Design a protein around this ligand. Structure first.
Ligand SMILES: CO[C@@](NC(=O)[C@H](C(=O)O)c1ccc(O)cc1)(C(=O)O)[C@@H]1NC(C(=O)O)=C(CSc2nnnn2C)CO1
Ligand SMILES: CO[C@@](NC(=O)[C@H](C(=O)O)c1ccc(O)cc1)(C(=O)O)[C@@H]1NC(C(=O)O)=C(CSc2nnnn2C)CO1
Ligand SMILES: CO[C@@](NC(=O)[C@H](C(=O)O)c1ccc(O)cc1)(C(=O)O)[C@@H]1NC(C(=O)O)=C(CSc2nnnn2C)CO1
Ligand SMILES: CO[C@@](NC(=O)[C@H](C(=O)O)c1ccc(O)cc1)(C(=O)O)[C@@H]1NC(C(=O)O)=C(CSc2nnnn2C)CO1
Ligand SMILES: [Zn+2]
Ligand SMILES: [Zn+2]
Ligand SMILES: [Zn+2]
Ligand SMILES: [Zn+2]
Ligand SMILES: [Zn+2]
Ligand SMILES: [Zn+2]
Ligand SMILES: [Zn+2]
Ligand SMILES: [Zn+2]
Lengths: 264, 264, 264, 264
């Protein structure tokens, strides 16, 4: 009876459905797939990328970028929410192919350096090509590219290095505060008494408060269904979107329900 | 007029005064120098090292270890307070020469990986040979070696990855709770409105509370004068030692005095 | 039409067939599977491991080690042939779980650091959890553990950092020179005019000469069928084994046949 | 008697004498100091940098670049000869400050990753801030930036990852083949019977042959005096320059004299 064959990290078919670039604000675009968010901000001095999706989306991301007049050498910075396979996937390949720089915090960098291996909750179940972080950022550090300022908000929970990003764009003159909050989910995570993550509960609760008090007029999540976005219906994709309070308050209800269900 | 020559990181002569191993508890020893703490815990299954001092103390540390019947292949784990040149110095050389493993948190690992370069406050002024962290630990994670349990307490302040370590030894039967708290100093640090460290103030204040509520009967610091230790006077070196409350309360007074002196 | 799902690196069922430790010489053992070689040398001062197989063999390797009276903290060094998924697989997990040190050359280290990703010929097709090399070794460097000396012989071909290892054991007194030569195969490799590996041909030809002039009385390969070993038939597993000249001369014939078949 | 204070890596005052950009060919410039070569190639799609000098030249290099109409975000690639403190010094700082990518071979990358620490011949005597290599290149790999092709020629000797670079520029129409050969010196190196570098002799001799058979009409070295360049006398700085044959033949004479002087 041989040892078992390796299993591939398979996701839903909706996560790999390539969509055309959908505009979010004057300078913010969505270039990922139908249920995976990949954001591209076009500044005068280059382009910023936030997340990327699955590792096999590197070629799709480059197309959407090329459609927006952005050549590979124009992508200056790659910002991340958290470094899992379905979010920080093609980061290694995009660095090799575009000459961009990764800006992430320490806990995200160390995870990104080992390709998601030895995950606190998944182990080596999901694994993506490893990338290196080029700039270590702290909580509240402002990253400016082409005059657009990205401020980091640490929300340690899903991963130790989860980070929500805040920037201010425009909408034909009207400034629009954008918040890109990370997933507040705990899928299969052992919440109470976790040896790998001992302060997981307090970290989650403190993250719930963080997202509530965010400067935000329009919120986006790595998974659109978390913010009730619907990338498929084009323009009215942001209609039934949630607030910051509504998002963190809904996540907290599912977290308390998870912790109570775990006592039994 | 040429560009300026590099300056060597020079310290006080007391920091490099090699001292003989001085016993702290039944299983805890001090093997560093007169004003630099290097702790060695002798378990049944190997030896743990906490800090090491300046990079040029690697050969002195090995001697003291050999005096305590500890061969190079007997040092299993290296634990760190914070990864600066005068504390995590010979860590690279000790890994090459003893086959030990480094256990540090993410913020300490990333700093240890670039040899203290690009320090938030010192820049490239101090720089030591880089080492790699072999185990990433979280706040409150218990590291056990030979039945002796080390629990990590994060005190982000001096460095983002500052860590106080707690273990329980004996004293001819009587169990003695030991706490190795990191420096709570801010030498030349810009406290108010630091762009590299924006949440420095709240991080310091939260560290002050952490050290107060530590399980501790005998406290040690990387610099003995911080805990009013006097490694020179041998046995009575722990006489006038401070408490946890007294240490963090004294550091907080000097921090508030520093922040107020900084407004002017 | 969604983007394609990731494919798992699946191997033959014979490669994952766990076998009992089979003795090769007085101090050399085989602890891998039926068609994957994992060698364990038991010295007076610790145990050396050469290769490991697929990443999912970490738990099987520990069993065989425990059967040979070798505790996890007794494995001092991990030596590698080349750093592919089916050979350097569980190296990350074994470091975390045994406190061993990896000794590999630069080209093997850099590949091992990115988990086989961006392979010159496979790309991201095969990928294993990344590990870090703790000692960089040169061509002809002698690694000694417990009085047993391992000398490295670089054979750049299959991978840039391919390495054959030579050590001298015993056989009830009679010294036996052992050579562990790496695979000399080029499965699907583009030999003529490769942009990623331009000097591939000369490197292969020079490797063919290297293996011929090896100090060797008994040869082993990462794949037993390459040396005509038959781990299944226990004691007579080394009966129809090949020589060094016969191995490199057979590989060269298949390489010239491959290069000529490639001109057409 | 305390342990000795650290010593700073001090160089000659000529090595830090900032000079104005001196043109070498139509697209090649020298932007370093009087006796340290830092080359800048201006292509239509960005700028390439070869070497940089001492770590404290990062601010001087940026000035000369800004004088040549090259903004920090215009430097796309950093190529290296060998990764020592006086050559690959400001590479860490230039990556943080310009968003460039480092292209070096494996042996150069691993050295660059530990900041020159644990040098085969200098140990931790010289140490610079560590940088990370973004693209691993092989012997004979062509790197193209803005239509200008750089081909790598490995000359393992001074360091295991020594590399000479060849590109073809112009001189008001006339194409000029440029070769940037690494130092062929062995200052204090133990040539015969070196345990850290066992194949040092054959590696040097093979490097001597490599540089002779280089496509080169004008040669430059990291140290101008090695090629009898005189950056000080402006235009006639390339007058009494050596050939490829003359350079490698002169270095070989000093190497054989060194090895014979070493037998005694
Ligand atoms: C690692 O990727 C996630 N999990 C998985 O892909 C699958 C799983 O979790 O069972 C396997 C995860 O992070 O848990 C991703 N992320 C989210 C999320 O909402 O963040 C949800 C929920 C599931 O899919
Ligand atoms: C980097 O090492 C420290 N600083 C220095 O060595 C010197 C400096 O700071 O001026 C230079 C530091 O951490 O600030 C060390 N540490 C402590 C401390 O008390 O932690 C104090 C105070 C000074 O010496
Ligand atoms: C990457 O692992 C090898 N390839 C594969 O696993 C499969 C493939 O190559 O098609 C995929 C390889 O190295 O080519 C391994 N190694 C050998 C070998 O003989 O070395 C042979 C032949 C195939 O299996
Ligand atoms: C490490 O830097 C070099 N050495 C030094 O700086 C000094 C030394 O070597 O004594 C110390 C070196 O590489 O040897 C540099 N390089 C060359 C050279 O010609 O390459 C020569 C000769 C000396 O200066
Ligand atoms: Zn995730
Ligand atoms: Zn997710
Ligand atoms: Zn410090
Ligand atoms: Zn200090
Ligand atoms: Zn292979
Ligand atoms: Zn193989
Ligand atoms: Zn040098
Ligand atoms: Zn030099």
């Amino acid at each position: 009876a041989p040892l078992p064959q390796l299993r591939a990290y398979t996701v839903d078919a909706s996560w790999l459905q390539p969509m055309a670039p959908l505009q979010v604000a004057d300078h913010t675009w969505q270039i990922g797939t139908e249920d995976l968010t990949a954001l591209l901000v076009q500044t005068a001095e280059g382009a910023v990328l936030l997340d990327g999706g699955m590792p096999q989306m590197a070629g799709h991301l480059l197309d959407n970028m090329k459609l927006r007049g952005v050549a590979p050498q124009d992508l200056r910075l790659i910002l991340l929410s958290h470094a899992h396979a379905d979010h920080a996937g093609p980061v290694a390949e995009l660095k090799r192919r575009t000459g961009a720089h990764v800006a992430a915090n320490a806990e995200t960098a160390v995870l990104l350096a080992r390709g998601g291996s030895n995950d606190l909750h998944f182990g080596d179940g999901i694994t993506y090509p490893p990338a290196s972080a080029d700039r270590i950022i702290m909580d509240g550090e402002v990253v400016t590219v082409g005059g657009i300022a990205f401020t980091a908000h640490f929300m340690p929970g899903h991963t130790p290095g989860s980070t929500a990003w805040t920037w201010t764009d425009t909408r034909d003159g009207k400034p629009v505060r954008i918040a890109y909050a990370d997933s507040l989910s705990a899928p299969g995570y052992q919440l109470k008494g976790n040896p790998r993550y001992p302060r997981l509960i307090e970290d989650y609760k403190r993250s719930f408060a963080t997202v509530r008090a965010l400067p935000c007029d329009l919120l986006l999540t790595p998974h659109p269904g978390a913010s009730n976005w619907n990338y498929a219906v084009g323009s009215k994709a942001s209609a039934e979107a949630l607030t910051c309070n509504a998002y963190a308050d809904a996540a907290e209800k599912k977290f308390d329900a998870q912790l109570a269900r775990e006592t039994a």
